[PDB]
Symmetry: C2
Subunit: 172 residues, 2 copies
């Protein structure tokens, strides 16, 4: 396979559904790559660098339709749909919320933040507040997903989502 | 030591801080208790029952001052302080948020929920809404703590980010009164 971060991270996402977060590491992934294993380290210094890219790709795949939208008229709806999409996506992956927890944007992901914030800026949120809104909504969703897992949940999720969104509206 | 679940679960919290959540299980707790280990199985049907009790004890210790408040007139302040206290507490234990994720009240902990909800009922929340408010605030705090644990990053940082969402969430809840 081509030696690129995304190709390796997408192979690791396959390994995640197969073996869980426990079965995902640089060594463990290099083992699933054969002669190409050692190339993994040129792009990821540690497990967390790999998990950051996996986490970003996992949610990019599901949020792409919302990311492509131009001149979003209703930031409330748009943010709510982001959260619902994140929740559905994390629930769809084995250890999805565990993989996401602690992740941060990659360099290429961070370059996409200005576009991500534009619907909120057009709504009246400052650039600084718009980013805090994004981080907060993702963390509320992450907390719901990781807790609702147990070896009503929908109602409780939207109850808190709508309250959060109403409180943000009061800030404008 | 005395053969009670609370003594067993508090020993398991020592194991959590020592070895992390991977070092916590019925078998490993039995090893820690030595000759008294087999007694734990009369009190916990499965690992999750142990984790449920640990998760309650962990936070009860820190929430006790807030739980003792009577005629709480400022439910906003009270709930905000509960969230801040949970956040501080979960961050103070090794794998604290991971231990907590997925836990549910025990029988004896559930008996305390009516008292937990009093400030919220007195503010005008129904019994169902008040419980949902508790769940929501704790899940928000859980998501923050679990995501905080990990160089310059975008945004204002964990404290300001946590408070931003807490205050927004509390304002939205106040809006349905
Ligand atoms: C310190 C720091 C800085 C920045 C972060 C950013 C930009 C995101 C995330 C972060 O966690 C961050 C973070 O922790 C997420 O997790 C997202 O998944 C998310 O929350 C949402 C959303 N709420 O719509 C998205 O649009 C996604 N694109 C992800 C953007
Ligand atoms: C499905 C269901 C039902 C009920 C739950 C309850 C009552 C709590 C918790 C739950 O998770 C629940 C849950 O999941 C917690 O986790 C708490 O730690 C919490 O959130 C707060 C708080 N917000 O003040 C507390 O005061 C604590 N005492 C814990 C009470
Ligand atoms: Mg994130
Ligand atoms: Mg809980």
């Amino acid at each position: 396979v081509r030696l690129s971060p995304e190709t390796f991270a997408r192979a690791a996402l396959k390994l995640l559904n197969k073996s869980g977060l426990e079965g995902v590491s640089l060594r463990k992934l290099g083992d699933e790559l054969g002669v190409q294993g050692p190339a993994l380290y040129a792009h990821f210094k540690n497990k967390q660098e790999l998990l950051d890219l996996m986490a970003e790709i996992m949610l990019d795949e599901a949020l792409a339709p919302l990311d492509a939208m131009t001149e979003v008229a209703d930031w409330h709806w748009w943010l709510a749909e982001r959260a619902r999409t994140i929740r559905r996506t994390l629930l769809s992956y084995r250890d999805g919320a565990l993989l996401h927890a602690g992740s941060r944007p990659t360099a290429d992901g961070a370059e996409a933040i200005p576009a991500l914030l534009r619907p909120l800026r057009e709504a009246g949120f400052s650039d600084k507040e718009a980013l805090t809104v994004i981080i907060t909504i993702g963390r509320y969703t992450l907390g719901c997903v990781i807790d609702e897992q147990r070896p009503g949940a929908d109602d409780t999720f939207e109850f808190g989502l709508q309250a959060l969104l109403a409180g943000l509206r009061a800030r404008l």
